[PDB]
Amino acid sequence: LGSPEFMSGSTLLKETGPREVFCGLTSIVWLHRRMPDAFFLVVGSRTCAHLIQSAAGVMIFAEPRFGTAILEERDLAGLADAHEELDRVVKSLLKRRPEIRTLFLVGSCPSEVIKIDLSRAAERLSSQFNGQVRILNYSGSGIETTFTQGEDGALKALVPLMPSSQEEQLLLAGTLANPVEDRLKTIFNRLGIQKVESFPPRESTKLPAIGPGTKVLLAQPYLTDTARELKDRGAEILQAPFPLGVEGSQLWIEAAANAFKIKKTLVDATLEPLITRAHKALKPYVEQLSGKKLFLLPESQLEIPLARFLSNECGMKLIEVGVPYLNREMMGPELDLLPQNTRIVEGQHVEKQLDRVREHHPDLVVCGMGLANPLEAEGISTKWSIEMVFSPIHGIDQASDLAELFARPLHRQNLLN
Amino acid sequence: LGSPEFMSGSTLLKETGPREVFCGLTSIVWLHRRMPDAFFLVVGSRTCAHLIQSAAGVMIFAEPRFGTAILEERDLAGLADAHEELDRVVKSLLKRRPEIRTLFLVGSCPSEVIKIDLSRAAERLSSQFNGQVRILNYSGSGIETTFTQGEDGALKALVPLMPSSQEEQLLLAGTLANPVEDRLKTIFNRLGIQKVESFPPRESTKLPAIGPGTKVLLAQPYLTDTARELKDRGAEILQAPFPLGVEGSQLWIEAAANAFKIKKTLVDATLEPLITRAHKALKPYVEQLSGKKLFLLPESQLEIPLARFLSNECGMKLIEVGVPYLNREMMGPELDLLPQNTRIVEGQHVEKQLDRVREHHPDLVVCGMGLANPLEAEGISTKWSIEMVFSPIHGIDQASDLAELFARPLHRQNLLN
Amino acid sequence: MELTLWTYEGPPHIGAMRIATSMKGLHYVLHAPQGDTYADLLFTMIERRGSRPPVTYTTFQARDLGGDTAELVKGHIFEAVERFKPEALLVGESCTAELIQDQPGSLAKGMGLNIPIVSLELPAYSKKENWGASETFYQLIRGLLKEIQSWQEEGRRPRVNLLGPSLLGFRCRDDVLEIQKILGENGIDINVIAPLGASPSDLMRLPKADANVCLYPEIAESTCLWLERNFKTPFTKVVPIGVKATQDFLEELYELLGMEVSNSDQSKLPWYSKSVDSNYLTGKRVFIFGDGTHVLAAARIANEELGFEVVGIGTYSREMARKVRAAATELGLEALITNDYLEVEESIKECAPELVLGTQMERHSAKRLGIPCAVISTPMHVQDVPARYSPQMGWEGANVIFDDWVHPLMMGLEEHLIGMFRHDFEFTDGHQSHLGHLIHWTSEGESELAKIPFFVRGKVRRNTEKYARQAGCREIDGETLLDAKAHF
Amino acid sequence: MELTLWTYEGPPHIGAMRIATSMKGLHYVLHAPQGDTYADLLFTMIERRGSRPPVTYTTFQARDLGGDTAELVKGHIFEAVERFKPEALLVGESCTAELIQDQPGSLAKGMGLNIPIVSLELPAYSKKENWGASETFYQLIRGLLKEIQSWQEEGRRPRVNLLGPSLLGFRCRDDVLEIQKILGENGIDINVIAPLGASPSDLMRLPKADANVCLYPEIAESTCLWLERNFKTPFTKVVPIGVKATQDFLEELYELLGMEVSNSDQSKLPWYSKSVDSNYLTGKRVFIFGDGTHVLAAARIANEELGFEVVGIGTYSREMARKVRAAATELGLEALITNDYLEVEESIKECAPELVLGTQMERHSAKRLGIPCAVISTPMHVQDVPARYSPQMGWEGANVIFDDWVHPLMMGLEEHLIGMFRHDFEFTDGHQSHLGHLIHWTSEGESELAKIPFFVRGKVRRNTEKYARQAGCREIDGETLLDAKAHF
Ligand code: PMR
Ligand code: PMR
Ligand code: SF4
Ligand code: SF4
Ligand SMILES: [K+]
Ligand SMILES: [K+]
């Protein structure tokens, strides 16, 4: 921990040391299901291969959806041409899965350290097919990306393939659950916004068009590069907090309505029943969560909006809000909503951070699954952090469900004892 | 054992005493699958109910295919009208399974002892619907029927419902496996017999017509009453051995060809390739089975044809051939094929019969599952008798499969030791 | 008459046969028609035993009804005693024999046999299997012992009888092993295990125990009560299925024996259920059914040890009714007391649970309704008489219970992914890959209903319709479904 | 490069981590990039452990590559030793760290630490997990003991070491328990169990044993060989998985100890497999795959104890290749030695077995091919680390094996009924209700092919096409299918 900085009444610290997070390769676990017509081929080692199947291999696959081109000794010794090897591997893969429409060559620590030019390989491979299979590249390496940053890489790679258009369009960027996607679209249509599309899409071949006149709402806080690339193609990136809970979702929706100049009386008549019902639904969880001390370890960059929601709407007390990365301009609107004197730590020293957890003994510690069960054995209740990336947590109507995710382990603690 | 009788060089004995066989109710286990559009409602006790589900309840049923109307104290005390009760029960059953096309009221020991007139109930119920559900009756009681005799009851009940016609027709009576049914039909069509139908059918509503000009081949040895009833409606009951193995199947097929006056050169040109291939297929099983001493306990009335096949075609030595019932006129052709001096026992004293098994110590004892495992523990190899009723054993082409059923437990004995 | 698609219990003579076969040196002459010998297969196939049941059936036919069926049973009694030479003889009737009333039991006592004779009076048209077994077990012991603190003074370890376990009982083979193991580690010896493994001679030693352990009340409660009245032997009433239940059972038995002082972590269930991969188990809706003992046990486990929400509960054991009703009341439910399979199926359908913990018969209704199921009680079939060690009782029993009751449920990651993405070509709605297998609703209303992730969709549809009725709502739409959710 | 949809083993450092975590008092400094800490979840989630692995990762980022990554690992070595104070220290690299070559191991030995230091040289691009674990286990013991008959004379019970068991090993938790139990009943004590549960101090006691028991050769064969060369300690080579194998193992160990004289019925598998409901198991076609030890074990069980016909066999353990080839030769097969999942899938597809006995990865191919599957070996996931007692070894292990390997198969009555009647509305082709879930062929030829009852239809189609090629046959018809059957 170094000298503190101060922004929006809140404290920003930075810590260096041992980290316990996922590399960006793990983005495949959710991305392969958002876009089933895509395949994710990692170029790396057996470690990378082992990572993905230790994650997703608990499920049984009739058809493979991901894989690893494992670097061999000859590759490292430069005795085999990397580009010839990639071509041969991609060749025999499309034999086993001839229905692949989009192939992602995902960079790893090994491929990025020795700098295999996967991007050019992707270009050349795309050329050799071009009517059938699109081949793209993004890095999911641990040395470069943390967890959800992998999605930022994947979406950024799709951006150049988005059709060019100057049409009216509200673009929702970031992985949404299917029913959440449909719900937000329905609401947006009630406001008079007829063109609402999602990025990423459900099919890799059907990318939304982009250009000037496209307003972009960022549903996920980890789309730094994707947002920048969307802006480079003419789209306007709306600034707003993230659609978590009533407060965040309301302002997020208002941002788009303001940009489309929708009359305030209409957006109020539309959002009012949703908000009132949400406040009603939230009550039993607030009862469970109010006054509870919360401590979040860095994982996904969801920690700041989650902390904002759990304190403002559920009445939890924040001990420490850890993030693996902090885009201050992007978290701007979110930092303004946070309660005063919030302690935010960018980076991590897991051992020292653990000491801070142990000395405080929080009511609920949001942490990874490398620390969850060990903390439980120490009599410290946890909420495994990964769940929020795999749950329908966005929108006014999902506020109570989001709160339930944190109320659940506390509730279970009571039931069992 | 009383004084012996002598027929076709073979010895016929009769034994009285404790029996170990199934009652005719057990016919439901195979009949409900031969005719899926039929339901089998037993009128009896909890014992009858327990019997059927202990048999078929190892399988999981989304939709019930059988059941029991369990007699209550009020029924026995005559305080409730049996006919009103039956009507109410059948009513609420057709509520749960409204797709039933044919309902079998199956008589049991309790219903037959106190003589509930199920037959009239079946008639009256049939009247009250008559466009939708057919309701019939047969007895499966232990006091009256043994095992496969239940099918004889069921088929006899369908006979009056068979359409009346004087058309050319070869009727195959008795449960055949679907592929066996199709195979025999294909062969019969090669001989020039264009009209070949099966009784029972695959759908209870689609019964074959009957009358003069109908030649009936009996595929099963336990259709004494059904054959008699078929004859009462004008059909000719062909006499022949039963289509087990090459010998039995050949003569069985020849019987129909002779009745239809098919030229012998045609039936020879058709059966020759089938017979030659069968002799080839039988060889490894004959090697396993030749010289082995066989002992069959009464179960199904299949024992005589099985013994005939296993001795004549597989070279087994017969110690004792037990049958629960012996229709001598019907087994006539079969008794002529049996090797001289075959010891056939009608009826049973299970304890004394067990002593005869133990004193001989046969290589293979065909017995029920109440004796199978206990005999195995005594170091006596068994072949569970029920299997032949649930296997495709009929026809020239199924000879090797039939032999395999008896070679299998002996083969396993070797593999395990 | 009573329409019965599936019967939860057999007739009472099966219970009698279960006693005779579980024991040694006890033969059973059963007056019954030809065909009732199917019962042998319960022991030779389901229990997979390498010996014939000690049962002699008279197996009368229709032709015998025109003759002397009474002489028929007398001959079989002679033969059975001569051939098998048992320590004691059970004589009884089947349902059909009960009609012709040959009084075979009293007949046996007038035949000059010099061994104890138990004449069984089992009403096949009023009572069932478990009552039959309990009655038989009771009469045999009452007959053997009728004519007829300390361990501290003797300087020996406390010794208890294990009463209840039997063939065709649920996992009795291993429950006995587990409990015997646990008692020995607690310094408590075993005196007599009965009926399973006991001879009539062993039953004579029953008063020699310091306390009676009633593992299966459906079979042995009447006996423990009789032993208490006549020999002052106290008996445990806590059945040790579940971690907490095993602890209570240990504390109870210690009191009856007068000892002082069972730790929780001796089972692995507490940690497994506490671990984070069990977080999503919280509030999963479960229906429970079976015999009284196993239902009561399962109820506490589901509610206090696993974190499930019990949404339905019942038993077919009418003798256990008041206890199941008390347990149901604590759970805020009304107990379903019935032997009617169609009523059970209906109750499951109505509360639409995510998991059914029932008998072999509940697999039928769960299959039709597409609900994950697990067997916790008889009636059972061969799958539930496994080769491996499979107790339900004690520390290890709770381990088996955790694995088996969680197994049918969709696993964590897959369940989350199906809630997120519904448009897959392989991982579709209701798919569970770990099993290795490939008044008016508006169009707007059903769309929000399809959003609901499968197994909980049933309750959602019910609650929304209940909500719509509970208000002035007509039809249903996407908003009223969200209204119903916030309402409950 | 090597296309890898599924990897049968992890990189070698996972094997090293398995040793350090299975042990106590042994820490592990791993030079690795940020993100490799996923390995912790193998122990906290799959093994469900309530403690962090004794592993300190340097977790370097891209920004660190512009700096002193060597100083980075030196700092973490200092911190780890100071904070955790272990008896001994493992120092090694991950695949990525192996590229930058910071020599962290030799660095550790130059930092003035006063505890034993094992410098791990694991080639992540040439070797895999099991080699990693075996190498780590070997170097640690070689390092600890380098500087350095009787039981009859001492008047004590023979004592053996159990070498091999580890976390992320297959059912090691219960295999150890079962074998330890069996040895004690045979009058044989346990000296040191390693690596699982052992400290570096315990490893010092390894020469004190009368014999070494090598339960998992993939992990402990190199060590037993080293212990034999240096301390004259003999070691068993028969792995006791299966009834016959356990018997041979007992006879072998007795010889090495010099004892005299294990009965077969101590397991229930022999009776269950001998009983009549196992008759139809004879000749069921099975494919076998996994690590060397479990494949060899499964092969004998399937062939000599269950009566299956092994139609395919292979391993990913290349160090076990010659033994799997010898076993395959006895079975009249060619062994598939590969780590290529696509090759395994292809081999299964080609021989079309009725049952697959493989790893977690074989479930993938069995699902796609619709073949009943069971896991017999790592790689595994959480389902195969159950709460209940689940050994594969010894008498009870064979019991578990019988239940689990027979379970995926369609049951007797249902299989017979589907061969008889194919026109049902519920019990259709390929349906298994006990799982509770609802060159040119002529038109004449395929009709006879559909007659074939499912799971054996695959082999029938192959054999008929092979038959048609083997002769002058063109097309295929109903008769040539029957000809092919009689031909084979
Ligand atoms: C690569 C290491 C690893 C291991 C050993 C597990 C085990 C495991 N992961 Mg998983 N998991 C790993 C990785 C990941 N998981 C991930 C996600 C995930 C979810 C949503 C879930 C889950 C689960 C598990 C579980 C519990 C078993 C299960 O229900 O799947 C194990 C053992 C499961 C759970 O209950 O977590 C608490 C669940 O809901 N994992 C992700 C997201 C990219 C990664 C990288
Ligand atoms: C009613 C008593 C009873 C019991 C306890 C069993 C158990 C059993 N019956 Mg079944 N079976 C019973 C009755 C019947 N069985 C019958 C048929 C049958 C067949 C074809 C088969 C079978 C089987 C069984 C089995 C073995 C488990 C199984 O695979 O189903 C048990 C425990 C099974 C087997 O392997 O038998 C050796 C098999 O192929 N039964 C029939 C024919 C009408 C009856 C009445
Ligand atoms: S990309 Fe890097 S951090 Fe991720 S699995 Fe591969 S080596 Fe490990
Ligand atoms: S019909 Fe008779 S023999 Fe059959 S189960 Fe009923 S009482 Fe028993
Ligand atoms: K009743
Ligand atoms: K390889």
Side-chain angles (χ1 to χ4, degrees), chain B residues 19-20 45-46 50 53-54 60-61 63 68 72-73 75 85 88 96 143 351 355 369 373, chain C residues 1-2 4 7 34 36 38 44 52 59 61-62 76 83 95 126 345 360 363-364 367-368 381:
Chain B
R19 311 291 188 88
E20 296 199 349
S45 67
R46 192 166 311 271
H50 193 243
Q53 71 185 47
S54 289
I60 311 305
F61 288 84
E63 298 295 322
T68 306
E72 309 176 288
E73 298 281 12
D75 296 313
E85 281 298 287
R88 176 191 61 88
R96 176 58 176 82
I143 53 175
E351 304 295 343
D355 295 337
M369 292 174 288
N373 284 332
Chain C
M1 303 181 186
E2 179 198 1
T4 301
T7 185
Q34 196 186 243
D36 269 336
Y38 81 86
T44 62
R52 309 174 61 212
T59 72
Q61 289 178 3
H76 279 113
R83 180 178 185 88
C95 56
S126 281
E345 179 183 49
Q360 180 77 354
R363 303 177 65 182
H364 298 320
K367 184 190 183 181
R368 190 202 192 207
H381 217 268

Side-chain angles (χ1 to χ4, degrees), chain D residues 50-185:
Chain D
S51 67
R52 309 174 61 212
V55 185
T56 295
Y57 311 74
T58 57
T59 72
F60 57 83
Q61 289 178 3
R63 65 191 293 167
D64 296 308
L65 299 180
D68 199 336
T69 57
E71 184 63 35
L72 173 61
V73 70
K74 175 191 281 195
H76 279 113
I77 291 175
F78 277 136
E79 291 190 25
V81 174
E82 174 187 20
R83 180 178 185 88
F84 297 99
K85 302 166 183 173
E87 297 181 16
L89 186 70
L90 305 187
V91 184
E93 306 163 311
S94 66
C95 56
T96 304
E98 194 168 343
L99 298 176
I100 66 174
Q101 283 285 309
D102 269 321
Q103 328 293 336
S106 59
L107 180 61
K109 299 186 178 184
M111 285 171 56
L113 319 177
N114 293 274
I115 61 178
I117 298 178
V118 178
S119 177
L120 300 172
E121 316 274 15
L122 314 182
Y125 301 94
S126 281
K127 296 307 167 67
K128 306 188 187 76
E129 181 177 349
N130 286 341
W131 186 98
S134 179
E135 169 71 5
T136 299
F137 195 50
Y138 166 82
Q139 298 292 352
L140 174 65
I141 294 180
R142 173 191 170 190
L144 262 34
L145 307 178
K146 197 192 69 173
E147 56 178 12
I148 315 157
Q149 334 267 46
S150 189
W151 73 265
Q152 294 86 334
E153 300 179 346
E154 298 170 32
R156 60 167 177 81
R157 286 155 63 103
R159 51 173 181 242
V160 299
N161 291 326
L162 298 176
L163 307 180
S166 56
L167 298 169
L168 291 197
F170 194 72
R171 313 286 182 82
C172 297
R173 183 193 68 186
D174 302 327
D175 281 349
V176 167
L177 298 177
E178 184 69 10
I179 288 309
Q180 177 173 28
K181 179 194 307 183
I182 297 175
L183 288 183
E185 298 167 358

Side-chain angles (χ1 to χ4, degrees), chain A residues 22 26 29 51 54-55 384 390, chain C residues 276-277 412-413 416, chain D residues 38 41 45:
Chain A
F22 281 134
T26 64
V29 182
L51 161 74
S54 289
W384 58 287
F390 289 73
Chain C
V276 294
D277 81 326
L413 175 59
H416 280 94
Chain D
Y38 81 86
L41 280 72
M45 294 302 296

Side-chain angles (χ1 to χ4, degrees), chain D residues 442-468:
Chain D
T442 55
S443 58
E444 174 191 344
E446 58 203 24
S447 303
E448 207 79 15
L449 180 55
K451 290 182 171 185
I452 311 299
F454 213 73
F455 308 90
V456 291
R457 188 176 305 151
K459 184 52 163 183
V460 166
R461 180 177 48 80
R462 303 310 169 95
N463 285 6
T464 307
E465 289 180 359
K466 180 177 181 296
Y467 175 85

Side-chain angles (χ1 to χ4, degrees), chain A residues 182-211:
Chain A
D182 301 335
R183 181 62 185 176
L184 290 181
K185 285 179 177 173
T186 298
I187 298 169
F188 277 135
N189 290 328
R190 289 176 179 165
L191 300 179
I193 310 177
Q194 294 195 356
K195 184 80 175 180
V196 178
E197 300 296 333
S198 61
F199 190 56
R202 296 180 184 186
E203 302 177 50
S204 59
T205 48
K206 303 175 183 175
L207 302 169
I210 206 202

Side-chain angles (χ1 to χ4, degrees), chain B residues 22 26 29 51 54-55 384 390, chain C residues 38 41 45, chain D residues 276-277 412-413 416:
Chain B
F22 281 134
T26 64
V29 182
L51 161 74
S54 289
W384 58 287
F390 289 73
Chain C
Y38 81 86
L41 280 72
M45 294 302 296
Chain D
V276 294
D277 81 326
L413 175 59
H416 280 94

Side-chain angles (χ1 to χ4, degrees), chain C residues 287-302:
Chain C
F287 188 95
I288 304 179
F289 202 81
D291 72 343
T293 299
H294 291 84
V295 163
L296 291 179
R300 194 181 180 187
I301 292 164

